[PDB]
Amino acid sequence: TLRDEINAILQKRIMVLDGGMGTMIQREKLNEEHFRGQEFKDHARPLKGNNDILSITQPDVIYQIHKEYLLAGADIIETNTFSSTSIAQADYGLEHLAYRMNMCSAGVARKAAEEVTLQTGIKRFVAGALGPTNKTLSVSPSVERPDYRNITFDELVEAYQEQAKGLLDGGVDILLIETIFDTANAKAALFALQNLFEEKYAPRPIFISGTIVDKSGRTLSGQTGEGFVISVSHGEPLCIGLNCALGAAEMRPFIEIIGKCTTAYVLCYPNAGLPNTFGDYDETPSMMAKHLKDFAMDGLVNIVGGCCGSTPDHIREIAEAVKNCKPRVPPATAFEGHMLLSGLEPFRIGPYTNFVNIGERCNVAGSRKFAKLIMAGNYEEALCVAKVQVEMGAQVLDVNMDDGMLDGPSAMTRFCNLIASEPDIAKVPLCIDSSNFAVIEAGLKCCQGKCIVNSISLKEGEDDFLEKARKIKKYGAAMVVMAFDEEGQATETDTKIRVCTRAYHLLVKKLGFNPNDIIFDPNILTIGTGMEEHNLYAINFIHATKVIKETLPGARISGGLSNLSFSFRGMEAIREAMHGVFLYHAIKSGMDMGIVNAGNLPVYDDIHKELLQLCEDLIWNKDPEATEKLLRYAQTQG
C-alpha cells in the first residue's frame, strides 16, 4: 500500500515537504480579474486573496509553482486546499464548490507530480491539506459567552468529510491535517476521515501537524505538545509533529518533546524566521538549511520543509543539507504499559502510579446539591464545584448529567464547553458518565483531550455492546465496562470475573481495542443493609479485582466507592472510615482508580482503632452484628 511505500522511505532518508505556496502566489501579483478567471466575473463577492480558487481560474500558476518546488528537491507537495471547506469558503460565496475545488487542486498537483517523477525518476507524493478553518470548537468566539460555540462537531465533520472526499477522488497519496489551532477540529477531521475510510474508500497515510503559538509551548486552544500528541494519536498517524508560526530555533525544544513521546515519525516545517515590520521573512535559505541540518544531525526529525517565508531556494538548500543525514529512529515503546489520558496536559497512569482519585461531586444523579444547581441553570456554581474538586486532589473529573427532568445531551454539551473555558479545570481529564449513550456522545464531541467513558456493558446484548465500543474507539477515548450482562448485575466473585473476561475477549479479539484503554467496574455494592444476602459484596469485589488484575493483561479496575457506604447516610465519619478501609484493601488487591470524594479519604493508619475494628468487621463480615455495632457506635457519640 501507500503507507508501506512511504514507511520504507522514511527509514532510509529524511524527506522534504513542499514549502510556502502562498509566498510564491503573492509574488505573482495577481488582482481581482486574475482571481475571477473567466468563470466568476459576475460573482457577487470579491475573490482577491482566495488562493484556493486559483486551481480552477489560474491552474497554470499553481502547476508551475508545484513544478518549481518539486524541482527544488521536495519529495512531497501539498494541494492548494488550505481553505477548501464549505465553512472557510462561506466568506467568498463559494461554499457550494468545495468538492470541485478540492478535486481540481488534487488534479493540478498530481499532474505536476507525475511529470516531475517521470523527468527525474524519483517518485514524488501529493499530500491533501486539510486546513483548520476559522472556527474553533474549544474556544468561544466571544469572551463574555464562555460556553458558546458558533460551530458544532457534526458540522465540521460534514465539511471535512466533503473536502476529504474531494481530495480522495482527486487521487492524493497523503492526507495532511496541518496548522491545527484547535485539537477538537483535528479530532473532527479524523472522525470524517474514519467515516470515509469505513464507508467506501481505502485508507491513505495521515499526517498530523500542530502549531505552537509562542515560547509558552501550547497550541492556540491551550494544549501542550504531549497533550496534543495523546489527543490525536487515536487516528494512528504515520507522521506527527509541528509546523510553522515559529522559527527553527524556538521550535527545537517542542519538536524534541514531541519526538520523545510518540512512536510515529516526526515532521517539522517551521517558518523562515520571524516576520519583519512589513510582513516579510528575514531568514535566508542558508540559515534555515543549517538550522534544519542541526535538527537532522541530532536525530530529531524525519520530514522537513517550510511554512510562510519559504521559497524553492529554501527548499533546495534544506534538501541539500539533509541529504546524507540519518533519519530519526522512533522509540519502540513510548510509556509502555501506561494508560494515556489528556486534558490540556497529559495524564498517564503506569504500574508505579498511585491510586487515581476521580472527583465524584459533579454528579446530577448522585449529588442532589449539584442537581439543584443544574436544574436552576446555575452553571457558574456548578463550575466552582469542579474547581474545588480539582483543588482538593481530584486527578480526573467525573461528569454526569442524568435526570428525567433534564435534557441530558444539551446539559452535557454546555457543561463541557464551560469546563473547557477554565484552564485550571481543563488541564485534567474528564470522565463522561451516563446511562444514556447520547449524553456520552455529546460529551465526547465537546472534549479536546482524551476522556474516560463510564459504564457501557453487556446489559442489552453483545451486538449493542460491540456497536457502542466501536463508536467509543472511533472517538478515541478510554472506556469502563461494568460487570453487567443479559442475566443481570454481577454480585458474586465468579460472575464478576466471567463477565469481565468475556467483555475483555470481545474488545480485544473482535474489535482490536487497546488493552490499556480498558477499565472494568466489578460493581462496588452497598453493604450493611440489614440483609444477609448483601454481606459478602465487598469481599466479592476485592477478590474479583485481584483475579481480574492477575488474569486479564493490561486491564485496569475502577468503581464507585461511595455506593459501599450508602446505608450510613449522614454518618459521614463512618462512611469515610469504611471508604478508607475498603480502599486500603482494594488497592492492596490491585485497584487502580475509583470515583471517590477526593479530599475526604482518610489514610488507614490514623483511623480510630475502635472504628477501624468495626469497619474491618463489617467489610470482611467477621461479625454478624457488625452493622448493628457500627450503628451503636454512631449513636453513642453524643
UniProtKB/Swiss-Prot annotation:
Its cofactor is methylcob(III)alamin; Zn(2+). The chain holds residues 17 to 654 of 1265 of the full protein. (6S)-5,6,7,8-tetrahydrofolate binds at G366, S367, R368, D433, N454, D521, N563, R569, R575. This is Methionine synthase. Modular enzyme with four functionally distinct domains. The isolated Hcy-binding domain catalyzes methyl transfer from free methylcobalamin to homocysteine. The Hcy-binding domain in association with the pterin-binding domain catalyzes the methylation of cob(I)alamin by methyltetrahydrofolate and the methylation of homocysteine. The B12-binding domain binds the cofactor. The AdoMet activation domain binds S-adenosyl-L-methionine. Under aerobic conditions cob(I)alamin can be converted to inactive cob(II)alamin. Residues 3-322 form the Hcy-binding domain. GO terms for biological process: axon regeneration; cellular response to nitric oxide; cobalamin metabolic process; homocysteine metabolic process; methionine biosynthetic process; methylation; nervous system development; response to axon injury. Widely expressed. Expressed at the highest levels in pancreas, heart, brain, skeletal muscle and placenta. Expressed at lower levels in lung, liver and kidney. The keyword Protein biosynthesis does not apply.
